[PDB]
Amino acid sequence: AIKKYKPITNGRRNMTSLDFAEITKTTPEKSLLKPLPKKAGRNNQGKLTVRHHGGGHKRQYRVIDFKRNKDGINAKVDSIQYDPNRSANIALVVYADGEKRYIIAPKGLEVGQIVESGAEADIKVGNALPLQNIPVGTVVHNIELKPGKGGQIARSAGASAQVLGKEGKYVLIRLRSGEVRMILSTCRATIGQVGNLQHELVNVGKAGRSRWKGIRPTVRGSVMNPNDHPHGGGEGRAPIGRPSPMSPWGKPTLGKKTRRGKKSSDKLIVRGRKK
Amino acid sequence: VKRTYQPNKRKHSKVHGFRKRMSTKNGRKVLARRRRKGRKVLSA
RNA sequence: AGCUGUGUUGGCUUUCUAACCCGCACCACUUAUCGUGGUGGGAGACAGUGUCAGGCGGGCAGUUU
RNA sequence: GGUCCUAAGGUAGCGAAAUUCCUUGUCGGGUAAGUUCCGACCCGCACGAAAGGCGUAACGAUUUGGGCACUGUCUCAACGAG
RNA sequence: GUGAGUAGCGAAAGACGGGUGAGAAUCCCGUCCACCGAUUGACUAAGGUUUCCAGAGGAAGGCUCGUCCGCUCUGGGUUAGUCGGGUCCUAAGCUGAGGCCGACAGGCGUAGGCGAUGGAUAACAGGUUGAUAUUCCUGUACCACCUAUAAUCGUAUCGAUGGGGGGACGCAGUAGGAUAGGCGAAGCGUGCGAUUGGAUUGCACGUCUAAGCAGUAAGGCUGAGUAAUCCGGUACUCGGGCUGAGCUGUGAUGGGGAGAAGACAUUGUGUCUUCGAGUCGUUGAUUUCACACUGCCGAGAAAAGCCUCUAGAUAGAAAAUAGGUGCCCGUACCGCAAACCGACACAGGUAGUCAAGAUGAGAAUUCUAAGGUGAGCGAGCGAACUCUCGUUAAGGAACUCGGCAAAAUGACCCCGUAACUUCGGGAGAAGGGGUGCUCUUUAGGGUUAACGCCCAGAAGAGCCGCAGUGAAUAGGCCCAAGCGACUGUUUAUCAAAAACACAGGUCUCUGCUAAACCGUAAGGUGAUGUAUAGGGGCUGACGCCUGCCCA
RNA sequence: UCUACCCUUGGUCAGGUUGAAGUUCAGGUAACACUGAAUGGAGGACCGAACCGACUUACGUUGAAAAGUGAGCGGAUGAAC
RNA sequence: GCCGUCGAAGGUGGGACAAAUGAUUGGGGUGAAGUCGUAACAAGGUAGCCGUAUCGGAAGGUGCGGCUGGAUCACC
Ligand SMILES: [Mg+2]
Ligand SMILES: [Mg+2]
Ligand SMILES: [Mg+2]
Ligand SMILES: [Mg+2]
Ligand SMILES: [Mg+2]
Ligand SMILES: [Mg+2]
Ligand SMILES: [Mg+2]
Ligand SMILES: [Mg+2]
Ligand SMILES: [Mg+2]
C-alpha cells in the first residue's frame, strides 16, 4: 500500500509515498522506447496556450499496444514494469511469435493470456474480445470507441466500466463517471479492473515534488490588478463583486455548461452525469 | 552591473545579416532604401 | 356542436441510401502515422457551409458625464 | 410576556483587538514614575465562521513591550594615527 | 569671458649608486626594501583586428614630467595527413518538392535537407628566434589510400539505402586497487665561515614521452536443433573463457635533460662552446583515473562510425618487404584586462583547466615558494573642520522616534541541561570548568623480516609569566505577546513584508475530433493523456469545527 | 545579445556534523510478538568557503561608478546556480 | 614562618515540593422560596429508567440499542 514517512523535517511532515512492491525487472526493454521532448503549452506558433506546465524530469515514451491484434496466440506475462507517462503500471507480454509487447496491467496478472474474437476467448482478467461476445454484468476496461481504432475509454489507474445489456445494434456501457452510453457491438474490451489502486492517497507533502512532475504555480485571480483578470484589485482584500465568478477570459466558470450540439452523441447518451 | 551589448559574431549575422534580409519580403524593402539613399554598407 | 370522406396548404415523427461528412480499418502512389486515389465499416438528408433575421455580448472598441 | 415588521432578522467561539469615534474605558500586574505592553470585565460607534472562526510545537535579515551581559550612545569631553 | 590660478589629479612603499641626455623624483642597469600568493601567478574559449617585435621620433594623446610608450614614420611578424573546426552523424529549432488553407502579401506541413553547446575521430618528447611552435628540425611512431609483389588460396572473398545486436546515458552514498604531487633519511656536486661558540654541519637535486611486446586489482554474464535468412527473437532434453581493465616490467634510450666541474672571447658584450659522473630507500597519499557497485523515485536524448545476417554481385585477395601520395579555414598579440562590454589608460561585470610549504577537519586564517608587480602627480607643515581607525578615570541606556552604531559572546575537549509539544523537536538551551613549555614510566592501529617511520590518547612530577585557541579567523543570551505554518519568491535603480506561491480542503465544467485557450482558416497545445485523468473559481499544513435565510 | 518565463545539449558546490527507513544478531515470543545493541546513510535537514543574493548602517550624490566600495548579513544537495 | 591535600560559612546559577496570597471566574451546598414553567410517583395524562449522541431560557425533548425496577384484560 502506502509507505508513510516520519516527520524528521517540516517538509516530510505529512508526505506519503506509494510502495513499489508490484514492480518486477526495473530496467526497460531497449527496443520499444521512443523519445519524448517536452513543451509547456508551446504550440506551433511558440506562444502559450494551456497554463501551468513545464520542467521537472526527463521522460521517455514507452510504446503501448492498445489495438490487441494477434488473434488466437497465447501470450505469457513476463515482467511488470513502471511507466511514468500514465497512472497505471505496465506489462511485458510475449506472444509465442517472439513479438514482445506492452499491455496496461489489470489487477492481478502474472499467468498467461489470450486475445481472440470469438474462438472461445477465455473470459478472465487480461483477455480482450468484442462486446457482442461478453456476457452481462462483466467489469471491463480499455474499451474501444470506433471499431478497429484503439482502446480509449477507461484507461486510468483503478478505473473500470460495466456492461449492462444489449440493444438492437449497440451494447450499453456504464462508465466510471456514471454515464450510461451506447457503444458499437464490435469494439473490443479488456476484461478486468486496471491495477495500481492505491494511487489517489499519495500525499505529495511538499511543494517541490509537486513541482518536478511538470507543474508550475497557479496565482489566484483576486490578487491581479484589473488589466488581466476580471477579479481585479480594489483596496484591501475584496469579495468578487460579480454575479458569477469568471475565468480569466470572461466566461462564467462556476455552473454554466459548456458542450455543444454534437454529432453522434445525443442519440447515444441516455443518462447524464451524476455530480 | 552587466551592460546591454554582449557581442557575438554569429547572432549578429544570423539576425541582421544579408541572407536574413533577403529571406523575407520586408527585408528586400529595407535593402531597397539603403542602396537608394546611397549608403556604403547595406547589411551589418 | 359534431360526425364521414375527397380535390389543395402547413407541420410532427418513422425508416431506407444516391449526395455530403469521418483527427474510421488494411491497400497503392512511396522502404513518408501529410496528402490524393481505391473495396469496405460508421453516421446519414441532420451536421458543416452561403445569404437573411431575431436574442444574449464591458470579452473589446469609440465618446459623454 | 405583549407587539410592529423582514425572505430568516448573528449560533459556537473570540472581545478597547493590524478591527473601539468619545477613550489616556475600567479594576489587577510591571516602574521611584507607564497615552505604548501583559491578564481579565463586555455597554461590540462598526468581530464572526472557506473575501474562513478559534488554538498551535517548529521556522523568521518580520513587528511590539521587559530583563541580565557589555560598552564614549550619555552626564562631559580630552589625546594620539593615516 | 566671470566663477579662478579655485575644486581636482581616479585605493596602494619606496630609497640610493651609476650611466644617458640640450634637458631626469618619472626612461634603462645594479643592490637593498616592501605587496599578492584559491592569486595581482601559469595555459586556453568569447570578443577585439596589428596592439605583437627591432631600428629612428617628441607637435598632438598620457589628468604632472618624459630621452619613455598600448601614440607618430620606416622595415618585419602568424608554417599542421595526427591539435580546434569542414570533406562523417543527429537534438531544440529553422527551411521545405508535391500537398492543405488565405482580399493580394502570405501562414502551416509530409519525404528530403541544414544545425554543436553532444556521439565518432590516426603524435609524442627535447632543441631553437629579435617576434611563431604537438606547425620549423632532431630521434622514434601511427591511420587512410595507391603501386609493385612473393608463401598464395580459390563456391576464398565484397557485402545495401534493408532486417538485428551495439553505441545508450539520472541524482545520492560508502568501502576499496593504483598512480600524481608532498615530507624525511644516507648515493652526487661546492663551502666549511673573522659577531661569543660549534666542524655529521650548511644550502641545493634525486631524470625520461607516445607507440609494441608482455601479465593485472578488481567489475560483468556460463552456452544445443528445431518455427529475409545459418543472425535476433521464441521453446526445449543434456549442461572449467568470455569480453572489458586503471597500473606496472623490459625495450623506446650507447640516445635526450640535469643542481655543477672545467675548458674559450674585445665592456669575461650581461655569452656560445669542446669533452664531463649521481639519479636509492622509507613513509603519508587526492576533489585524478568507473555511474563501477549497493540504495532510492522524480524512472533518467536521438542517428552514425563499429559487429554480424542474408537479397545480391562476383570466382582476386591474408601476412610480410619496398618505394609513393594526403587537400580547405583559424594560429601574432591582450584574454578577472592600459588591448573585451561600461563615452575614458573607469575602485564595476566577464564560462572553464592547473593551484605547492608551514599551522589546520579545509580550496578558512596568518607568513612565504614557483612566479609577478611597486599602481603615471610629487615635495613640505604636522591649525580648525570633514573622512577611516586606536585607547580612557567614576557611572553604565541617564542618550534617543528606537540600545541606531560600537563593546562583549566566538575554536576544540568535558560535566550538565527547563517549560513545552505534532514525540522527530526544544538545544550550541541555559549556566559551567580545563588548554603553555620540559622530563620520566605504561597500555593503543597500519606499514615492515626487523632497527626505522607516520597516527595518537592516560596519570604522575616540575618550571615560568599580569595573561598559556597568549597574534589573525569563528554564535551574545533569556521571559512574554502579535501575524503568517514551513524552505522558497516579489517592486533591475527610495518598499523584502503580515503581500505572492505552497502541501492539503472543497466547489463546478468536461464520454474524446473532450471542455479550455492561441490562430480570420489550415493546423496545433490539452496528450502521442482518456473521470484515481485534464481546464477554471475561492480558502491556504495540522488540530476542533463551519450556524439560520432561495423574497 | 539586457531582463521575463521556456525548450535541446553540457559544467560546477572546500570541508565538518547529526543518524530516518530498513537489514542482521541477541532477548523474549508460538499470546496480541515488541524492547536493546550493531550496521545502513535518509532529508526543499544544522554550522561554513567558492558561488549566487542585497537586510541594517556609515561614506559617496558638478561620484572612482546614470545604482557603487568599507564593516557586518541570508541561502549554500536544491522550488540551486 | 612559608608550600600542598581535606575542610564550616559565604557568594553565583538553574531547577524540584508544599504553603501564604491575587483582578476576575466556574460549579456546589445552605433559605425564604417572591420571580418563570410541570419533568417524575395513578397509564402522572407522550409509560419510566440505564448507556450514548445532538439541540433548548427552565426542568428536559428526540434518535438508535438493552431492561421490567411496564397499568389496562398484565400489552392473546
Ligand atoms: Mg470603456
Ligand atoms: Mg596549501
Ligand atoms: Mg587566503
Ligand atoms: Mg539560544
Ligand atoms: Mg526557548
Ligand atoms: Mg480546430
Ligand atoms: Mg548582484
Ligand atoms: Mg532579485
Ligand atoms: Mg443483555
PDB file of C-alpha atoms in Angstrom, chain A residues 67-69 71 114-123 127-136 138 140 142-144 147-148 163 166 170-171 173 183-191:
ATOM      1  CA  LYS A  67      -5.105  -2.453 -30.566  1.00  0.00           C
ATOM      2  CA  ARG A  68      -4.873  -6.052 -29.240  1.00  0.00           C
ATOM      3  CA  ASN A  69      -4.337  -7.809 -32.554  1.00  0.00           C
ATOM      4  CA  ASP A  71      -5.683 -13.270 -32.704  1.00  0.00           C
ATOM      5  CA  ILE A 114      -5.205 -14.796 -24.906  1.00  0.00           C
ATOM      6  CA  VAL A 115      -6.589 -12.373 -27.482  1.00  0.00           C
ATOM      7  CA  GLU A 116      -9.193 -13.847 -29.817  1.00  0.00           C
ATOM      8  CA  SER A 117     -12.522 -12.573 -31.054  1.00  0.00           C
ATOM      9  CA  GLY A 118     -14.889 -15.481 -30.564  1.00  0.00           C
ATOM     10  CA  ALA A 119     -12.970 -18.776 -30.664  1.00  0.00           C
ATOM     11  CA  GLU A 120     -13.542 -19.468 -27.033  1.00  0.00           C
ATOM     12  CA  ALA A 121     -11.609 -16.345 -25.941  1.00  0.00           C
ATOM     13  CA  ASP A 122     -11.478 -17.450 -22.290  1.00  0.00           C
ATOM     14  CA  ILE A 123     -13.151 -14.731 -20.227  1.00  0.00           C
ATOM     15  CA  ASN A 127      -8.308 -11.184 -22.245  1.00  0.00           C
ATOM     16  CA  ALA A 128      -9.687  -8.899 -24.955  1.00  0.00           C
ATOM     17  CA  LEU A 129     -12.696  -9.865 -27.057  1.00  0.00           C
ATOM     18  CA  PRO A 130     -15.535  -7.842 -28.641  1.00  0.00           C
ATOM     19  CA  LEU A 131     -18.573  -6.630 -26.766  1.00  0.00           C
ATOM     20  CA  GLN A 132     -21.050  -8.898 -28.545  1.00  0.00           C
ATOM     21  CA  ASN A 133     -19.118 -11.853 -27.070  1.00  0.00           C
ATOM     22  CA  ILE A 134     -19.163 -10.600 -23.458  1.00  0.00           C
ATOM     23  CA  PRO A 135     -21.976 -11.642 -21.085  1.00  0.00           C
ATOM     24  CA  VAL A 136     -23.727  -9.060 -18.971  1.00  0.00           C
ATOM     25  CA  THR A 138     -18.897  -8.053 -16.612  1.00  0.00           C
ATOM     26  CA  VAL A 140     -14.332  -4.339 -18.445  1.00  0.00           C
ATOM     27  CA  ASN A 142      -9.874  -0.050 -22.015  1.00  0.00           C
ATOM     28  CA  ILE A 143     -12.859  -0.113 -24.363  1.00  0.00           C
ATOM     29  CA  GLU A 144     -12.629   0.949 -27.972  1.00  0.00           C
ATOM     30  CA  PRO A 147     -14.310  -0.137 -34.459  1.00  0.00           C
ATOM     31  CA  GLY A 148     -10.687  -1.085 -35.042  1.00  0.00           C
ATOM     32  CA  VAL A 163     -21.621  -3.900 -19.488  1.00  0.00           C
ATOM     33  CA  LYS A 166     -27.509  -5.455 -25.375  1.00  0.00           C
ATOM     34  CA  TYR A 170     -25.182  -1.426 -29.914  1.00  0.00           C
ATOM     35  CA  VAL A 171     -24.346  -2.513 -26.374  1.00  0.00           C
ATOM     36  CA  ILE A 173     -21.976   0.583 -21.039  1.00  0.00           C
ATOM     37  CA  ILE A 183     -21.060   1.641 -27.927  1.00  0.00           C
ATOM     38  CA  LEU A 184     -20.999  -0.281 -31.228  1.00  0.00           C
ATOM     39  CA  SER A 185     -21.056  -4.039 -30.841  1.00  0.00           C
ATOM     40  CA  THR A 186     -17.662  -4.850 -32.419  1.00  0.00           C
ATOM     41  CA  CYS A 187     -15.467  -2.744 -30.148  1.00  0.00           C
ATOM     42  CA  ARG A 188     -13.051  -4.749 -28.047  1.00  0.00           C
ATOM     43  CA  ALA A 189     -12.712  -4.728 -24.277  1.00  0.00           C
ATOM     44  CA  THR A 190     -10.092  -5.994 -21.879  1.00  0.00           C
ATOM     45  CA  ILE A 191     -11.808  -7.906 -19.076  1.00  0.00           C
TER      46      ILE A 191
END
